[PDB]
Amino acid sequence: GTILIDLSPDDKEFQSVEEEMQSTVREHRDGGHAGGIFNRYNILKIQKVCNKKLWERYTHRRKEVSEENHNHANERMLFHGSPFVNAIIHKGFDERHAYIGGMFGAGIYFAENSSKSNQYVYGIGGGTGCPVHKDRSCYICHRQLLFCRVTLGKSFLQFSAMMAHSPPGHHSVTGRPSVNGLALAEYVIYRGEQAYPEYLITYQIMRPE
Ligand X SMILES: COCCNC(=O)c1ccc(-c2ccc3c(C)cc(=O)[nH]c3c2)c(Cl)c1
- Binding-site residues for Zn(2+), please? 130, 133, 138, 141
Give the separation between CA 191 and CA 70, rounded to whole angstroms.
Answer: 20
185 binds, among Zn ion, ligand X, none (CB under 5 to 8 A by kind): none
Footprint of ligand X (CB under 6 A) = 79-83, 99-100, 109, 111, 116-117, 120, 123-124, 186
CA angle 65/68/49 to nearest 5° reads 10
Q: Is 111 in the site for Zn ion (CB under 5 A)?
A: no
Among Zn ion, ligand X, none, partner that 138 touches (CB below 5 to 8 angstroms by kind): Zn ion
* Residue, CB closest to Zn ion: 130
3-state secondary structure of 193: helix
Q: Does 121 bind Zn ion (CB under 5 A)?
A: no
Interaction of residue 139 with Zn ion, rule CB under 5 A: no
CB of 142 to Zn ion, least distance (A): 9
The least distance separating Zn ion from the CB of residue 35, rounded to whole angstroms, comes to 13
Q: How far is CA 82 from CA 67, 71, 76, 77, 137, in A?
A: 31, 32, 19, 17, 16
Q: Shortest Cβ distance from residue 81 to Zn ion (Å)?
A: 16
CA angle 56, 83, 174 (to 5 degrees): 60
- Do residues 145 and 114 touch, judged by C-beta distance below 8 A? yes
**Residues interacting with Zn ion, by CB under 5 A?**
130, 132-133, 138, 140-141
